[PDB]
Write a protein that holds these residues in place. Structure first.
Motif: not given
Lengths: 418, 407, 418, 412
Positions: A251-268, A359-366
């Motif tokens: 959970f800590n690893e998933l939290y750190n990659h998703t919940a710490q900030d509102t970083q722009k959405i990339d594939e990761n 995936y396609n409703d929230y991904r960046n890029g094309i």
RNA sequence: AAAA
RNA sequence: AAAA
């Protein structure tokens, strides 16, 4: 004039699906009779509207009889009936209808694998469902009707009804999924394929085996990302229950990659969000308060601390070989997801479409449009839905002749009230 | 000369129970033929009933045509078409050489698919499908059963009471439920004979998909009936394993109060893999509310608190927490669990502060068996010692439980 | 054979209540006709079962005529109607019926004060609702039927339906409330009387006036305790909106008496819990933290801080004179609830029963039962319900002849579908 | 030459019934309003309003009193040409249809009653049918021009400006000049969403959650883009107004307005925020950022019984909120409204933006059949929600009449 | 149920 | 009561 009779079970779905299956052999009844033992809890006229969307106008009359075999004898006998389906209901009801109905034809929907039964109409692939004349024993082909008078193009479909949409459409020809390049999937697209079961790991069967032995599990991040909702079945055992522990490190690893900030959405971030949602679907966040980022040694150490304090064996599940080796060296039972196999049997097409629409409703890029086509022509498009607990996808149908989602939407409402 | 036939379904429970129900109408066949659709200690259990029969499994294959021609090639007296697919029953009632076709009618199917005798026999009717009249039960006595002691689960013990009830009046001796001391009143709630009205609120909230946390007393008093109250078809098992409740149950389980918290911890472990990973370290009233608030803040689900304590519930409601408070009692006028009641009362009996007493089952005033508390690492059983060899049905239910577990 | 016809409006409630008012004039139709300009978006089903519990057992039919006054001309002319009700629907629809219908009687339901309309059936007192023959102009009196074939004793009633239950029961004689000495209420019982509006404070009119001037309010605990949900109307105008600020001092006092611990329940805990629930129904708990201020000066000091940094006038509300005088000595406009008034007009009987059921269900000593009796005969008993957002009281009818709550429960489900 | 109508407790129905009849070409000398209760209008510029329409008339009010019998008595003797029965109770309409001296009984049929009870001209006249109830003919509209006004300027709310466009549309093609919405810049796209011409697909989710009793917090971009349309989306009749006033959103809006380019959006958001909310001055939250909004939503979620839903137009914020267990509505997908939207809101938004545009200032104008009719000017007042309309064509100065009509209904 |  |  055409009268189609059937039996009214305590289950609504069997009576509904028996009627609907008969309509898909070309039959257009003008009256439908439901012979019941006990009065029904509550039906709806939405069955009439759903049948209307298939080109069928019909009176739906329920006739309550009771327990008596001789009472069933008399009322069945002197009722004018043309076709009588006997799939639903108790055995004595089907016997009474078969021997004593004045029907020209008596029919029976034969479901080879009952484990796929009692779901929304169209869920079971139509090649594994057979309509049989009981008097002669002949398989009778499907004549799938088109939809008519469907004003509303948009519907909300759950995973099972989305699969039912594909099967019903498959009666008319070749159904295809556009928006995904199956020969060159990107990282998230590959993840969605594993999440749907189109691709599986051979070692998933080791998770099942360890579940029968009553071991407890801890999984790292990528197990939640790649196995998704399918992990629930693998780690559940009828005798020992839910064996997957809610790892703090995962959970800590998933939290750190998703919940710490509102970083722009990339594939990761989409990948880790898929893991986070799958984690939440299975566990309440065990971290009421803790923030410590270790990743490799953290999960092993957490498994060791648990190993010291419970009687059950603790098995670690990971898709990382280096972590798996390190865990084994410190004396830990380990399942390493390594061997990929492509599923030739059953998998979850609805889950794949849900994952790809997300995936396609929230991904960046094309981004890409997720579409469903029949015989090369587009039938519908798919859009994600906000509500993650009652999981739906929004289907916009662009062909008025094939708007089965609206019928499935109405049917889902009927089934849900039970 | 007398041959009984039935259908082989994918479930063994229906074919087995159809045979036993037919035998319990007085039938003693020499051959039992099970007409199957595919190659898939029974004879010993029928032996214990005075039935010495050949059980033959005759496979026909799929297809209604295959049945229309092959079901005729056998001599049968009584064919029971209760189990199996409809078409298998259809051809058997029309192309068999059987003088009598029968059907075991289950009034409420939700009670079905259990061990034989679990359904109360007043709800189970054997009929001839051609006449339709009720065929009365003629229950056979047990024969050649020399071992008196058996180990029964909670359902098999209920089935024993029901099967014994076919012979006459069944009574329990060694318990007076009037003036139920603290533990006795608890066993009545665990068995479901006494219920809380607010159990409907749990069911209603479960239909809406809420998550639940429950205090120690809920696990103690509702017991394992909690499993069905919090299970919904759409979302599944809605009861979270409260770390606060586990801590308080572990602390008390580390001698009248000790019985209470052992009963609560037994139900907790039967419902939950314990929340080992949770860092909550409290074991009191406010710990439960605060644990519920922390979960509520961080999950998508609606969180509802279940308690049997008004003061806790009102304090929880004062903090914005939706709460179900088990206060008002109703005596159950329908079905409850005699087995759970006897399991609960047996465990208490060994640890009562007074004098040791015997719980026994009797038929028409005559002692049939005794119930003894049996403790194993995993199993949940009661030891039944039958002192009347004519009614040693537990030995048969013991065998049948094995055969069903093989599923 | 009575054929009671009526008009079907987009509102279902005006239709539903029109039929029920006719049936409470002794009328027992075997057929009911609903004339429609449009097909109803919804589809009512329990409308039949509600009438069956009143011993009516009729047919219901929706005649869709459409737009046009000739279309309403012809399709009304050749239709057999005995009694026609023209209360619902557009004026043109009523005109067509009172002109070209072969009906013997044509009836109108006169509602003097419309503001009490469009509510659950029986909400407006039956002495304020008149059934009139349009041709003659005379007032047909009520012939209230009894309940038949209803064995489900328990029902869940909202506040409006509970007051509708009392009004319907009053058609048979003297309805009384058992379980409370009205002339000698204890502390909590007196509080319930003020919350229900049976007793009001005359200075409540000052709250309305200062709201119309656009003032902002801070209220101490006893205002929430004693005024309850009635406070919402007093501090709201269409122009300036919701004027009551969520006082940090009042919540701290309510929190300390209710949420600091799990103390046993006495009278004062019940009193402050009623205040806490009322506070939560009006504000989000403002303090994300603590300040540990509670007492006299805290609310005044809070009101002074707000006054110095907000433009609108800040008015303190209290029922404590000593605090009220102290605030005025600090230059704060104060509304002091002191002068009691017994309500001779409309108040909230349903809220009173809600408040008393809550008090007696979580009480301290001798177990008092709240019952509703008619002509001295016990009719039903009341119990609290766990759900505070969808507010209900569990009604248990001990008299099969007066089980109106089951009808009101069914009707409420239909009204909610909007 | 006598027009009659019924006097309801609502002034708007009786007034609009009179005005609609005048717009079917009627020019009465006497208007009779038959009432039931001793109430009056307490003031009426109706004679002045009708005078501006070339209707030099006297308005008479006849009180009768409760009862079918009394109505049947006092209606026959009254000599009337045209009687409109749209307002009032059914029975008063019933008697005036059967026992009246009027040669022609009429009914103003409103297709969608949800659009009614507003200022005259608010409903598109295509939805408004004047009917003779005897036969059933639709009576065509014959709109009168304006006379004797001489006051070019008026102050109109959003609903009156829309009423101006609809009434002016009875004379032909109405166009808005000085505005090119295609190639929409950042603020022009915002105004199109505020007016509802373009709507978000996920607005349906807001309605759905509101019907389920949820509480809402919204980020700054929701107030900017949805504007006052939020009032309808977050209101449910069963539970009421469901949008909580976020302190995080207020702090961001306050920081950007109270201490130019691109400041226009934040003013528009703040205007909508204040119009919907009493500012949460009592809240101790001091953050004004992405995480602050999510964290404020979590603290409310923890402490309240209601379900809490976050509304945002930012996918990155919404996906972060979902990762913390927060149910989130993310406004992303756009549909062009095939049906009704607020022309007045668009013009109010564009007028306000016009005073602060880049480069040149352009004047917004309303034309009829290619001929200029009026100009729209931004006007500033503490509690206004008003636009300034200067009519340059004496013949079409309906804003002056609407200004009078807005005053009469204001005393409701 | 006083523009359904 | 789509293999009580």
């Amino acid at each position: 004039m055409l009268i189609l009779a059937t039996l009214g079970s305590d289950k609504s779905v069997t009576t509904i699906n028996a009627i609907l299956t008969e309509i898909f052999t070309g039959l257009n009844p003008n009256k439908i009779i439901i012979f019941r033992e006990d009065p029904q809890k509550k039906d709806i006229k939405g069955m009439e509207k759903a049948l209307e969307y298939l080109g069928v106008n019909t009176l739906i009359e329920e006739k309550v009889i009771g327990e008596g075999i001789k009472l069933w004898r008399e009322k069945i006998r002197n009722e004018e009936i043309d076709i009588f389906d006997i799939t639903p209901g108790r055995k004595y009801m089907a016997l009474s209808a078969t021997y004593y109905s004045r029907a020209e034809e008596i029919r029976y929907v034969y479901l080879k694998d009952e484990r796929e039964g009692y779901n929304i109409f169209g869920y079971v692939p139509f090649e594994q469902l057979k309509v049989i004349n009981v008097r002669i024993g002949d398989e009778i082909p499907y004549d799938p009707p088109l939809t008519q008078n469907v004003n509303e193009a948009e519907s909300l479909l759950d995973v099972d009804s989305l699969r039912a949409f594909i099967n019903i459409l498959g009666l008319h020809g070749k159904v295809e999924i556009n928006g995904i390049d199956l020969e060159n999937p990107d990282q998230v697209e590959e993840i969605c394929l594993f999440r749907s079961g189109k691709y599986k790991y051979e070692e998933e069967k080791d998770i099942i085996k360890e579940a029968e032995r009553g071991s407890l599990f801890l999984a790292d991040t990528n197990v939640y990302i790649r196995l998704g909702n399918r992990l629930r079945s693998l780690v559940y055992n009828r005798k020992y229950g839910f064996r997957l522990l809610s790892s703090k490190n995962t959970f800590n690893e998933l939290y750190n990659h998703t919940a710490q900030d509102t970083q722009k959405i990339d594939e990761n971030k989409v990948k880790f969000i898929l893991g986070m949602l799958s984690y939440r679907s299975l566990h309440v966040p065990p971290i009421t308060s803790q923030v410590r980022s270790s990743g490799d040694m953290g999960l092993i150490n957490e498994a060791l601390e648990i190993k010291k304090n419970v009687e059950d064996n603790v098995v670690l599940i990971t898709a990382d070989k280096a972590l798996g080796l390190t865990a084994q060296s410190k004396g830990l039972r380990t399942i390493i997801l390594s061997k990929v196999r492509k599923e030739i049997g059953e998998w979850d097409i609805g889950e794949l479409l849900f994952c790809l629409s997300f995936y396609n409703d929230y991904r960046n890029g094309i981004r890409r449009m997720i579409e469903i086509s029949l015989n090369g022509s587009k039938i519908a498009e798919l859009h994600s839905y906000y509500h993650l607990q009652e999981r739906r996808v929004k289907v916009r149908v662009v062909d008025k002749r094939y708007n089965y989602p609206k019928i499935l939407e109405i049917l889902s409402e009927i089934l849900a009230t039970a």
